[PDB]
Structure 1
Amino acid sequence: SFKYESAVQYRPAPDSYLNPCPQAGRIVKETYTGINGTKSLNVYLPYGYDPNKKYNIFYLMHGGGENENTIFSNDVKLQNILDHAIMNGELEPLIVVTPTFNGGNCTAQNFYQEFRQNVIPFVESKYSTYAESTTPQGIAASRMHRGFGGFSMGGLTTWYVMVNCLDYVAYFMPLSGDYWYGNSPQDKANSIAEAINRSGLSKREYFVFAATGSEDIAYANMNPQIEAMKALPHFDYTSDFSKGNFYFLVAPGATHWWGYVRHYIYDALPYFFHELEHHHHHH
Structure 2
Amino acid sequence: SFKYESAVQYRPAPDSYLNPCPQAGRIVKETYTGINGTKSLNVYLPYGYDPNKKYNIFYLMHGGGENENTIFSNDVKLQNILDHAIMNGELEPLIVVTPTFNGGNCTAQNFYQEFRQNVIPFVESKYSTYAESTTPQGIAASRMHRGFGGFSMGGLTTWYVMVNCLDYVAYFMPLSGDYWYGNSPQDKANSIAEAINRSGLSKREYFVFAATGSEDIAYANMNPQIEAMKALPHFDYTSDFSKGNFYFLVAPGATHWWGYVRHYIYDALPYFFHELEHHHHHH
TM-score bin, normalised by smaller chain: over 0.9
Measured in 1, the distance between the counterparts of 2:134 and 2:83 equals: 28
4+ residue runs of structure 1 moved beyond 4 angstroms?
A: none
Deviation at 1:166, TM superposition (A): 0.1
Partner SS, residue 249 of structure 1: strand
Q: Which whole-Å CA distance do the structure 1 matches of 2:276 and 2:221 have between them?
A: 33
- The DSSP-based 3-state class of the residue aligned with 1:27 is strand
- Which whole-Å CA distance do the structure 1 matches of 2:252 and 2:126 have between them? 41
Could you tell me how far 1:201 is from its partner in structure 2? 0.2
Deviations 1:122-154, CA, capped at 9 Å, x for gaps? 000000000001000000000000000000000
CA distance in 2, matches of 1:129, 1:259: 29
SS in 2 for 1:75: coil
Deviations along 1:140-173, one digit per CA (max 9) or x if unpaired, are 0000000000000000000000000000000000
- Give distance in 2, aligned partners of 1:23 and 1:139: 30
Deviation string, structure 1 residues 188-216 (Cα, Å, up to 9, x no partner): 00000000000000000000000000000
In 2, Cα distance between the equivalents of 1:278 and 1:172?
20
Using the TM superposition, give the Cα deviation of residue 185 of structure 1 relative to its aligned residue in structure 2, in angstroms. 0.3
d(CA) in 1 for partners of 2:27 and 2:201?
34
SS in 2 for 1:277: coil
Per-residue CA distance 1:164-183 (angstroms, 9 max, x = gap): 00000000000000000000
Counterpart Cα distance in 2 of 1:192 and 1:52:
36
List runs of 5+ in structure 1 lacking aligned partners: none
Following superposition, the deviation at residue 57 of structure 1 comes to 0.1
Report SS of the residue matched to 1:255: coil
Distance in 2, Cα, partners of 1:277 & 1:135: 21
Measure how far apart 1:89 and its partner are: 0.2
Q: CA deviation at 1:266?
A: 0.1
Give the secondary-structure state (helix, strand or coil) at the position aligned to 2:266. Answer: helix
Q: Tell whether 2:102 aligns with 1:102.
A: yes
- The residue aligned with 2:163 is 163
User: Partners in 2 of 1:257 and 1:82 — Cα distance?
Assistant: 18
Distance 1:265 1:233 in 2: 27
Report Cα offsets for 1:89-137 as digits up to 9, x if no partner: 0000000000000000000000000000000000000000000010000
Q: Which residue of 1 aligns with 2:34?
A: 34
Q: Paired residue for 1:124? A: 124
Q: Offset at 1:248?
A: 0.1
CA deviation profile, 1:190-244 (whole Å, cap 9, x unmatched): 0000000000000000000000000000000000000000000000000000000
Q: Deviations over 1:32-70 (max 9, x none)?
A: 000000000000000000001000000000000000000
Provide the C-alpha distance between the structure 2 equivalents of 1:55 and 1:192, rounded to a whole number of angstroms. 28
Write the distance in 2 (CA, Å) between the matches of 1:126 and 1:235.
35
Q: How far does the alpha carbon of each residue in 1:239-282 deviate from its partner, in whole angstroms, 9 at most, with x for none?
A: 00000000000000000000000000000000000001000000
Partner SS, residue 22 of structure 1: coil
Q: For 2:194 and 2:120, how far apart are their aligned partners in 1?
A: 25
Rounded Cα–Cα distance in structure 2 between residues aligned with 1:68 and 1:95? 15
> 1:123 aligns to what SS in structure 2?
helix
The alignment's C-alpha RMSD in Å is 0.2
CA distance in 2 between partners of 1:61 and 1:84 (Å): 21
Paired residues, number? 283
Structure 1 Cα separation of the partners of residues 164 and 185 of structure 2: 19
1:205 alignment counterpart: 205
Counterpart CA distance in 2 for 1:80 and 1:43 is 14
In structure 2, the gaps of 5 or more residues are none
SS at match of 2:235: coil
Q: Distance in 2 between matches of 1:220 and 1:52?
A: 45
Does residue 253 of structure 2 align to residue 253 of structure 1? Answer: yes
